Design a protein around this ligand. Structure first.
Ligand code: ANP
Ligand code: MG
Length: 508
RNA sequence: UUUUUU
């Protein structure tokens, strides 16, 4: 194929809903829906993508725009227009398939489609069904059958599951497929799923294998992502529509970034607590924050510490892949509505989730991938609002911060050191009710986590892994102590002849 | 180890 760049222009003539209506691009019914939301105007990415997506040209579209700047409606608006344009054809059939990397993000995109319905009841005829894991499969299919949706929103696993059994019934007339958070959906462990999805939709399509037009959206995207998307893009040319300069960092400039550097990984726990205590005092409990952690087990632990310190001041919500899907959904609903509170999560909540008026994003440790730094802090400072972020790390994670500068051109101006008082250590540790076995599970999860990103973030394995393991002794308040392990376990990790493993583990 | 059908 061939890539057509369309970079960020200086004084490009503003595009509005009114202008698009008069031009023939938008029908009155979708113009009225969006107009009724009382937005000041269309965001830059919306201004840039709406007509090119709807255009009669035979192209795929790639779009980059910063966090919180309205990518969702950037694709929903033209999708609706396409359904109106073709209202008399295959009306009981799926014409647009939107795919997301998490269930909660798919369900949020569905809720945004519902907001379009709620603003113009005349658009309800273009029905929508979400197909995501952790929901009753049969009930969703009853919904497919009852509503005969034109729009499907899905996570990959559940979509493949459905496609293998019912692609002929609902999916032989798909015109558009959208990968939101496209870069994530083309990493290893999603790429093969997307290629299966793409191959099934293409083989089943009633006009041809190259009918489907593909749209990719992310805050983090380059030309290299078009290469990764090669087996799933049908068209002869690809528009790259960019609202961010070539060199400009992908992080949203309105975010006030800082990093707090400790000598030990565990000390980031105490720094975080002192930070939150201070923000609750200074803001008189009017504090809405999200705090990210590396693993499910440490997220749970972190939540217990924060409930013991702060449950009296603020609700504390625990959000990760092992929370049941019903509770994930209810807590997302609550946290979107609430004025204050602390959401404690893994990267399940790093991308896409739109929680209005979060004041701060806090990170304890590193994200699951470089890019997810940009997405994490992007949970704040959304839709014109302000926001700040704090990264709590230890000295041995500093090469992560240098990689942000080298790879993504992100330079964090505010940087300071931290050392915990014995008073804060005692306060936090004495209310830890986890058993030694539990602390071991927790720290072990962090070792596996850090080990998997050593190369990506240029860590010194010899320094970072022993530091992470020594968390165990910090938390049991004896820092001579090593994690008690068996020989057959240490052989499984491949460290039985390593000095690095000798410094982390005791063979009890 | 983060997500992602069952
Ligand atoms: N034209 C607009 N004017 C003002 N607000 C808008 C507009 N379009 C969308 N929004 C709001 O902006 C918020 C963020 O939109 P969203 O589509 O989630 O951003 P995004 O670019 O997908 N962010 P991310 O997924 O984190 O990269 C939502 O609460 C929308 O209601
Ligand atoms: Mg988004």
């Amino acid at each position: 194929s061939k890539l057509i760049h369309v970079p960020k222009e200086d004084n490009s003539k503003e595009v509005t809903l009114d202008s698009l209506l008069e031009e023939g691009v938008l029908d009155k019914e979708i113009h009225k829906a969006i107009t009724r939301m009382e937005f000041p105007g269309l965001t830059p990415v919306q201004q840039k993508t709406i007509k090119p997506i709807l255009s009669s040209e035979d192209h795929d579209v790639i779009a980059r725009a910063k966090t919180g700047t309205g990518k969702t409606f950037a694709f929903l608006i033209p999708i609706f227009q396409h359904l109106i344009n073709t209202k008399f054809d295959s009306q009981y059939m799926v014409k647009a398939v939107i795919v997301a990397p998490t269930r909660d993000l798919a369900l949020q995109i569905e809720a945004e489609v519902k907001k379009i319905h709620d603003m113009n009841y005349g658009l309800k005829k273009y029905a929508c069904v979400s197909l995501v894991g952790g929901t009753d499969f049969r009930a969703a299919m009853n919904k497919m059958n009852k509503l005969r949706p034109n729009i499907v929103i899905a996570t990959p696993g559940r979509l493949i599951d459905v496609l293998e059994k019912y692609s002929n019934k609902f999916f032989r007339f798909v015109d558009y497929k959208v990968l939101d958070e496209a870069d994530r959906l083309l990493e290893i462990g999603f790429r093969d799923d997307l290629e299966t999805i793409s191959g099934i939709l293409n083989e089943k399509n009633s006009k041809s294998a190259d009918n489907i037009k593909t749209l990719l959206f992310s805050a983090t995207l380059d030309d290299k992502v078009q290469k990764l998307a090669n087996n799933i893009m049908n068209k002869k040319e690809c528009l790259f529509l960019d609202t961010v300069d070539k060199n400009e960092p992908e992080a949203h400039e309105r975010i006030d970034q800082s990093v707090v550097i400790s000598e030990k990984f565990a000390n980031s726990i105490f720094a975080a607590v002192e930070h939150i205590k201070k923000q609750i005092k200074e803001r008189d409990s009017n504090y809405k924050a999200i705090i990210f952690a590396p693993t499910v087990k440490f997220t749970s632990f972190l939540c217990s510490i924060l409930k013991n310190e702060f449950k009296k001041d603020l609700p504390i919500l625990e959000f990760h892949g092992k929370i049941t899907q019903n509770k994930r959904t209810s807590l997302v609903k609550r946290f979107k509505k609430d004025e204050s509170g602390i959401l404690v999560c893994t990267d399940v909540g790093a991308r896409g989730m739109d929680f209005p008026n979060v004041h701060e994003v806090l990170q304890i440790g590193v994200p699951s991938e470089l890019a997810n730094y940009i997405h994490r802090i992007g949970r704040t400072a959304r839709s014109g609002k302000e926001g700040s972020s704090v990264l709590f790390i230890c000295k041995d994670e500093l090469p992560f911060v240098r990689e942000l500068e080298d790879a993504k051109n992100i330079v964090i101006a505010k940087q300071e050191k931290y050392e915990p008082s014995e008073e804060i250590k005692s306060e936090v540790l004495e209310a830890v009710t986890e058993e030694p076995e539990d602390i071991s599970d927790i720290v072990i999860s962090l070792i596996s986590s850090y080990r998997s990103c050593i190369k990506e973030y240029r860590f010194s394995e010899r320094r970072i892994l022993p530091e992470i393991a020594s968390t165990y002794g910090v938390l049991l308040n004896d820092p001579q102590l090593k994690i008690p392990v068996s020989r057959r376990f240490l052989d499984k990790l491949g460290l039985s002849r390593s000095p690095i493993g000798k410094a982390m583990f005791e063979i009890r």
